[PDB]
Structure 1
């Protein structure tokens, strides 16, 4: 009765497919964002320097 079961499972009564999904490879990256440099400016304005 054991052989008859093994005899019941065929190649054309139990095919055996393989299937995987396409997985992207993991990757570890660094990104440092530093804003534009900020420069001190000193200006004086007097009535003469405008007129000059």
Structure 2
């Protein structure tokens, strides 16, 4: 009107996506033997 007409603008940022992923470890295995003593 008195200040001349303004000018529209646009800006947007980069929005990464949210993912839900779940993984597992495991208890390592073990061995259990029995032996006798030789002569």
Question: Do the structures match in fold with TM over 0.5?
Answer: yes
TM-score under structure 2 length normalisation: 0.59
- Structure with the higher helix share, 1 or 2: 1
**Cα deviation, residue 12, structure 1:** 7.3
Aligned length: 39
The structure whose Rg is larger is: 1
Q: What RMSD over aligned residues (CA atoms) do the two structures have, in Å?
A: 2.8
Structure 1 unaligned residues grouped into runs of 5+ = 1-8, 48-52
Structure 2 unaligned residues grouped into runs of 5+ = none
- Structure with the higher strand share, 1 or 2: 1
